[PDB]
Amino acid sequence: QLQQSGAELVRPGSSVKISCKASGYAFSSYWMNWVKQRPGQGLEWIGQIYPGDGATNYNGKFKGKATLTADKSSSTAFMQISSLTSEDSAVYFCARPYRYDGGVYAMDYWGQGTSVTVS
Amino acid sequence: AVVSTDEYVARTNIYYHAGTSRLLAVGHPYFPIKKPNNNKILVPKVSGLQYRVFRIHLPDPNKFGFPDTSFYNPDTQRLVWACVGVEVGRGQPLGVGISGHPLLNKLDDTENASAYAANAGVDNRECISMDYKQTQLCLIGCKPPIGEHWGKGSPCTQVAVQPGDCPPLELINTVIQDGDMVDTGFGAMDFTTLQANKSEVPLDICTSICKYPDYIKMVSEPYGDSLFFYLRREQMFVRHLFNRAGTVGENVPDDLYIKGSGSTANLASSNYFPTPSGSMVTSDAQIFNKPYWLQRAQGHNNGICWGNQLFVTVVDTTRSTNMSLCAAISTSETTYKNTNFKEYLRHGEEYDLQFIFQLCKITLTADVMTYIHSMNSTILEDWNEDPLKKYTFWEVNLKEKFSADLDQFPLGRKFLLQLGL
Amino acid sequence: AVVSTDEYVARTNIYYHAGTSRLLAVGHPYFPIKKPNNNKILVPKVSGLQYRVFRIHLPDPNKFGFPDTSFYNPDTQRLVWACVGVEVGRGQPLGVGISGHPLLNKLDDTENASAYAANAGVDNRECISMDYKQTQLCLIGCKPPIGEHWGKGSPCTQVAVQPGDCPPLELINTVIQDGDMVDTGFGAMDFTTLQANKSEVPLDICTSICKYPDYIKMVSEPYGDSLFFYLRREQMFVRHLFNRAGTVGENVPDDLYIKGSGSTANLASSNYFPTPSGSMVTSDAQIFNKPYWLQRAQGHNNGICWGNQLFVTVVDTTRSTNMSLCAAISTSETTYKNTNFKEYLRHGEEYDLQFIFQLCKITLTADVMTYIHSMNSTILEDWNEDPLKKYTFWEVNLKEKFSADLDQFPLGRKFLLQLGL
């Protein structure tokens, strides 16, 4: 069970911090994966975080735009977006790696999705 | 400043022989057998891999009844026993034991692989045994022996230990006790507090502490009472090279390799561990059943048994043979049935300690009394309860074993022949 | 012309003992543990396969405060410490480590094959470990130790190096720093700059340089300050015989064989590489925990510690035991789950250096000053900042450790007993 934040409306140039709270398992063993989907369009990979030491990999497209963090004490993942534009309006999803610290065999548990409007 | 005992301890010409009859120990090699509902030990754990610490009790030479007492002045001086010869007799045939674990944490064989190993599921533990590293050693002194081992150090008050975090190490000095285990090839550490797994090593050391004599510390000791003589012989080699199942506690820095793909996409456990093996055991390499002449000690205490005590620590894995004995539940059917026979394991140890003691006298002058007092106040207090009651050791009483006729004993004859006069 | 120090260095009758308390080193056997985002080292790499280079700092005998100073003239002469006895104490139990790589470049087993091996696809790397070659060595001098290793030489300005072209070799002399790696069976070379592969050898030497003491060069050294005494003991044998995956860098001349066909049509990699194995480790073969009396040096510098410095290089793989310690993420379920335990690896090293120094005096005559000046101008300048700041070594300060009572120490007793008077 993963819980994401409610809908956001932010003005161009602003910034947003969105959470994904983990529950029903031991968070301290798993990364968190994040993707992006624009209205009526496909899926794109943003990055994934190892909460333990804050290590993370970036999709080049989201290098300066995205930063990932996580609160081990409360088992929650966070993603912040900077210098928001019309292209950042989309539904964002958090998703757990199937195999502990490995990122193969697909994403087996997804969050409900959080909608962000830049306007 | 500390000084050799030769300074204040006078040597008489009287010599006595003393020896245990024949010590015997029988039990289970890996763990003690006890009542489940109960806690009373029915059968003890007896293994060739344990330390044997003998607490030798000597008759107080001052209370002793010598035929002649003209050799000294009971007013100005006192008497102490000095150990001059020791013979640690061993009695079973030479042989090698073997220890394992039904659920040893052993993923795959990393000594040589033809294809990338599968994938760790849940519990990939195997029933595995090994022949521990060979060790022969003998420590003698008037104080109990001291060992070292790695244990879980106390954490720094900062970053809250996340569950599963690697525990901090700390070299811990301890008193070696009779029954303690010897490093078997996995080093000297406290496996109970450093391995939650409970399956990293064989059952016999699995929830114990393997200790190693802290030779450095003991010899640095100012007075050198803990050990004034020792013999050590240890050898070991790598039999097998394995992998550890479990989850990466610390990941392999990616600057050390090129990411794989497909099968090699996921890194296999690089938490390798070897299986020890103390090679062949031999007569020519025996340390025991030979007399040790403690004439010149490297420490300042030259074999003086203050407190009429004497410690003999031993470890001999050259006679570690375990014998399996099985009894039939029924003596009928002429067809073998594994269910008809109850299989067991037992190991026996046979010792025989022998000593040659030299009577000594100490004129209790001012200086001498000041020195001895500083060194160990109890010396004087006892002269004209147990301080180590908390520890344990094979208690050996020799108060009724002293004999002036060395002639009549094997260690005795050897001594006379060796010392000529 | 160079001359023995016995020529211009006078020997007094004063002797001092000095020793480290007990050095201890704990860390990860293969690589350092650090913060991913960061670069600060959280846990250092500590392996029995690294060199330990101790930079021993001695109190300036000229600034020192002796009870008596009549033994020399502070106007015509100066004082220098001379190393006369060393005891490298080692403290963990004997044992053998083990190193591997999760993606080692090992195609097939070439030691014995029943049918021609398949065909190299993409990434045929295997998770493989091995027991490195045994090495015990001790170098002592007043200058840091120097090693040799093969590295990538500079190319000749001609034929533009085609990518993938074999890199040129060049024996490179270097200063052996504390923490450097010892040849482990793959020779002394720079694997980082000579193996793009990053999978030819185990992780612990994988991106390091394995250096070998350049004994030839150091002994040829005119003044012989870099090393005036040494002990070396190395052994190794071939455990396994493998193949290397990758592509033919240099093809096998066809005059060396008859073309095959079908399966044997295509030649298998003949880029063989063996797996090393330093056999069994033994007490009888120990180099340490024995005193070394540096009385007659083979070089011209007979143990004079110019600069009040002293270098002690050591390598001991006879105590390379690595201990795996795993912590449970949860202490609930009574069913083993590999996911419930985080496995780690740690290795501990224990040292204890002890020395006996002899005070010496040098009357600063003209000739003497010309000589010493040519030899090493700093000598005189310092008499009545760190020149090796670039290099790193285990710093050891003994300025507060000298004692005139050799009597009170184990190495000291040994020395007195050995030298009689």
Side-chain angles (χ1 to χ4, degrees), chain C residues 196-207:
Chain C
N197 189 282
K198 247 176 185 175
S199 304
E200 305 285 282
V201 302
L203 294 323
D204 63 340
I205 63 164
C206 161
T207 63

Side-chain angles (χ1 to χ4, degrees), chain B residues 103-137:
Chain B
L103 296 161
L104 185 82
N105 183 19
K106 178 266 177 173
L107 188 55
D108 19 74
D109 191 330
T110 73
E111 173 185 359
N112 178 353
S114 40
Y116 219 66
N119 244 156
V122 196
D123 202 330
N124 303 79
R125 305 179 298 183
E126 320 287 330
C127 173
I128 304 268
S129 60
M130 57 207 81
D131 56 287
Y132 286 161
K133 105 171 186 178
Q134 185 171 165
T135 299
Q136 288 187 72
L137 72 87

Side-chain angles (χ1 to χ4, degrees), chain C residues 68-374:
Chain C
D68 183 65
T69 45
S70 71
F71 67 79
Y72 92 115
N73 192 318
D75 300 35
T76 35
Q77 51 211 197
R78 288 282 167 270
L79 304 184
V80 199
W81 283 123
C83 186
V84 186
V86 170
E87 239 252 50
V88 174
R90 299 287 285 119
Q92 291 291 300
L94 264 51
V96 186
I98 182 185
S99 303
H101 195 315
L103 297 163
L104 185 83
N105 185 20
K106 176 267 178 170
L107 189 56
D108 20 77
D109 193 323
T110 70
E111 175 186 358
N112 178 352
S114 41
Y116 220 67
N119 245 159
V122 194
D123 199 337
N124 301 82
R125 304 181 298 184
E126 321 284 334
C127 176
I128 296 188
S129 59
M130 58 203 77
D131 56 284
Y132 285 159
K133 106 173 187 179
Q134 187 170 169
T135 300
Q136 287 187 72
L137 69 87
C138 181
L139 316 168
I140 307 189
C142 66
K143 291 286 189 189
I146 297 144
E148 56 167 37
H149 74 275
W150 295 95
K152 190 217 277 190
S154 66
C156 264
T157 313
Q158 295 103 40
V159 199
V161 189
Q162 300 295 301
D165 273 15
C166 182
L169 280 322
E170 184 227 308
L171 195 61
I172 306 167
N173 266 311
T174 158
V175 172
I176 301 175
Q177 297 185 73
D178 182 73
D180 269 320
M181 305 302 278
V182 198
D183 63 299
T184 58
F186 295 84
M189 58 184 262
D190 180 351
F191 304 86
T192 311
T193 80
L194 257 22
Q195 305 187 325
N197 189 282
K198 247 176 185 175
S199 304
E200 305 285 282
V201 302
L203 294 323
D204 63 340
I205 63 164
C206 161
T207 63
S208 292
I209 303 134
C210 282
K211 315 206 275 197
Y212 186 63
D214 194 335
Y215 299 98
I216 315 291
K217 185 190 186 69
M218 292 188 273
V219 181
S220 294
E221 168 172 337
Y223 295 106
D225 302 304
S226 60
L227 89 75
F228 34 67
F229 165 82
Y230 77 81
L231 282 181
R232 60 149 108 87
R233 216 122 303 174
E234 51 192 293
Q235 62 173 50
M236 177 253 264
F237 82 86
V238 177
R239 163 90 78 145
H240 282 110
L241 299 77
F242 297 155
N243 236 188
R244 291 282 194 201
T247 63
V248 184
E250 280 159 347
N251 268 112
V252 182
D254 43 15
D255 62 293
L256 298 187
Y257 72 103
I258 288 124
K259 283 278 234 228
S261 68
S263 52
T264 59
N266 296 307
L267 248 45
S269 164
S270 52
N271 270 170
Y272 316 103
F273 82 93
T275 288
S277 171
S279 199
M280 178 169 73
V281 281
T282 148
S283 304
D284 302 312
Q286 285 294 286
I287 282 291
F288 320 101
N289 290 310
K290 290 167 59 186
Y292 313 139
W293 304 125
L294 317 177
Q295 35 178 65
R296 255 116 280 178
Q298 38 55 268
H300 281 136
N301 178 353
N302 209 318
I304 304 303
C305 305
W306 301 119
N308 313 298
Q309 268 188 172
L310 193 282
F311 277 88
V312 173
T313 310
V314 172
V315 170
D316 180 25
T317 69
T318 69
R319 288 178 175 79
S320 49
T321 296
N322 297 137
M323 55 200 115
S324 65
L325 44 162
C326 87
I329 192 148
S330 164
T331 47
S332 321
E333 349 82 297
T334 65
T335 307
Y336 186 82
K337 298 173 193 175
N338 303 105
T339 63
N340 180 51
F341 309 92
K342 275 169 162 299
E343 291 287 319
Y344 306 77
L345 282 184
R346 287 288 131 79
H347 179 280
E349 216 78 64
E350 186 183 329
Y351 285 77
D352 172 80
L353 315 179
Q354 314 160 57
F355 313 72
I356 300 298
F357 294 92
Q358 192 179 331
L359 189 59
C360 289
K361 41 158 74 171
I362 299 73
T363 310
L364 299 171
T365 75
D367 323 81
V368 180
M369 289 203 262
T370 318
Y371 187 93
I372 289 56
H373 176 273
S374 300

Side-chain angles (χ1 to χ4, degrees), chain B residues 54-55 208 250 296 308 390:
Chain B
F54 305 102
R55 223 270 205 65
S208 293
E250 278 158 349
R296 255 115 280 174
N308 311 300
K390 350 148 43 54

Side-chain angles (χ1 to χ4, degrees), chain B residues 101-413:
Chain B
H101 196 316
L103 296 161
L104 185 82
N105 183 19
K106 178 266 177 173
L107 188 55
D108 19 74
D109 191 330
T110 73
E111 173 185 359
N112 178 353
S114 40
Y116 219 66
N119 244 156
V122 196
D123 202 330
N124 303 79
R125 305 179 298 183
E126 320 287 330
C127 173
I128 304 268
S129 60
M130 57 207 81
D131 56 287
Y132 286 161
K133 105 171 186 178
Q134 185 171 165
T135 299
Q136 288 187 72
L137 72 87
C138 176
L139 316 167
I140 309 185
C142 65
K143 289 288 189 187
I146 294 108
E148 56 171 37
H149 73 279
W150 297 95
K152 189 217 281 190
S154 68
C156 261
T157 312
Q158 294 103 37
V159 216
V161 190
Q162 301 294 300
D165 275 12
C166 179
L169 283 319
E170 185 225 308
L171 195 60
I172 305 165
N173 268 314
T174 156
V175 170
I176 302 178
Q177 286 182 84
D178 184 73
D180 271 321
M181 307 299 280
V182 199
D183 60 296
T184 55
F186 293 83
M189 57 186 267
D190 182 347
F191 304 86
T192 311
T193 77
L194 260 20
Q195 306 190 324
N197 188 287
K198 248 174 187 176
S199 308
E200 306 285 283
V201 300
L203 292 322
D204 62 345
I205 63 165
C206 153
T207 66
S208 293
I209 301 95
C210 283
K211 316 207 273 195
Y212 187 63
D214 194 332
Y215 300 96
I216 315 291
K217 187 189 185 69
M218 291 192 277
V219 181
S220 294
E221 167 169 339
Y223 295 108
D225 299 305
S226 62
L227 88 74
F228 35 65
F229 166 79
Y230 76 81
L231 282 182
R232 60 150 107 87
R233 215 121 304 173
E234 52 194 291
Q235 59 171 49
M236 177 253 264
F237 82 85
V238 177
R239 164 90 79 148
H240 284 106
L241 299 80
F242 297 151
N243 235 190
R244 289 281 193 204
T247 61
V248 186
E250 278 158 349
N251 267 109
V252 182
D254 41 15
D255 63 292
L256 297 187
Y257 73 103
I258 295 163
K259 215 60 256 257
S261 68
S263 52
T264 60
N266 295 302
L267 250 43
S269 162
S270 51
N271 273 171
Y272 316 98
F273 82 93
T275 288
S277 173
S279 197
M280 178 168 69
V281 279
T282 150
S283 308
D284 303 313
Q286 283 295 285
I287 269 172
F288 318 102
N289 290 307
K290 288 166 62 188
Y292 312 137
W293 304 123
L294 318 178
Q295 36 180 64
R296 255 115 280 174
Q298 36 56 267
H300 281 130
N301 180 353
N302 208 317
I304 305 300
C305 303
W306 303 120
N308 311 300
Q309 267 186 172
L310 192 282
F311 278 89
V312 173
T313 310
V314 173
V315 170
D316 181 26
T317 65
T318 70
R319 287 177 175 80
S320 46
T321 295
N322 296 136
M323 52 205 118
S324 62
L325 44 160
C326 80
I329 191 106
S330 163
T331 48
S332 327
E333 350 82 299
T334 65
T335 305
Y336 187 84
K337 296 174 200 176
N338 302 104
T339 62
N340 180 52
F341 309 91
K342 275 170 162 296
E343 292 284 323
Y344 306 77
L345 282 182
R346 285 290 132 76
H347 178 280
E349 217 78 63
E350 186 184 326
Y351 286 76
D352 171 81
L353 314 179
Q354 313 160 58
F355 312 73
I356 300 295
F357 294 96
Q358 192 178 334
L359 190 56
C360 290
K361 44 156 73 168
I362 300 131
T363 311
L364 297 172
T365 80
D367 326 79
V368 183
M369 287 203 261
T370 321
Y371 187 93
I372 310 303
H373 177 270
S374 304
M375 187 177 103
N376 180 181
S377 283
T378 76
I379 310 264
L380 301 167
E381 318 190 305
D382 296 307
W383 271 338
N384 194 165
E385 135 226 79
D386 170 21
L388 320 80
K389 186 207 69 70
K390 350 148 43 54
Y391 312 103
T392 273
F393 351 75
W394 194 313
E395 297 302 331
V396 172
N397 204 298
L398 295 187
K399 299 162 185 168
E400 257 110 73
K401 299 302 201 69
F402 277 47
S403 170
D405 314 310
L406 318 183
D407 198 0
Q408 303 309 83
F409 308 82
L411 211 213
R413 293 166 225 137

